[PDB]
Design a protein around this ligand. Structure first.
Ligand SMILES: [Cl-]
Ligand SMILES: [Cl-]
Ligand SMILES: [Cl-]
Ligand SMILES: [Cl-]
Ligand SMILES: [Cl-]
Ligand SMILES: [Cl-]
Ligand SMILES: [Cl-]
Ligand code: NA
Length: 129
């Protein structure tokens, strides 16, 4: 599913991401825009052989099982395919574990490089929330 900007802001809010670990909803929308262009089916292979999955490009090295990432963990206890659903629940619940891990949203290199310190409230401007 390719979300609209306000549609995804609403869905993330309904699933409890607004101000989760102190990160305002615009941070999460911005991170999704640059990780996936709001496409739940986004995948990207890393040079180390791990794969990133879904709207927040969550990596198989630590967070999900795809059966092809040797020596990896599955800390969200989900198949990586769950992260590609039209239903964002699995992605949101796994993102809450990642952002709690110690480095906050810096876990997402596109957030650090493209969202951090910018006017992220622009990403939710206009939306009925
Ligand atoms: Cl947009
Ligand atoms: Cl915001
Ligand atoms: Cl594996
Ligand atoms: Cl594990
Ligand atoms: Cl699995
Ligand atoms: Cl959803
Ligand atoms: Cl933090
Ligand atoms: Na894994």
């Amino acid at each position: 599913k390719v979300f609209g900007r306000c549609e995804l802001a609403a869905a993330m809010k309904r699933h409890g991401l607004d101000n989760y670990r102190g990160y305002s909803l615009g941070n999460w929308v911005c991170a999704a825009k640059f990780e996936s262009n709001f496409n739940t089916q986004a995948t990207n292979r890393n040079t180390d052989g791990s794969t990133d999955y879904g709207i927040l490009q969550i990596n198989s090295r630590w967070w999900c099982n795809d059966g092809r990432t040797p020596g990896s963990r599955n800390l969200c206890n989900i198949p990586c395919s769950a992260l590609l659903s039209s239903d964002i629940t699995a992605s949101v619940n796994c993102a809450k574990k990642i952002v709690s891990d110690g480095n906050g949203m810096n876990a997402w290199v596109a957030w650090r490089n493209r969202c951090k310190g910018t006017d992220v409230q622009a990403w939710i401007r206009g939306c009925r929330l």
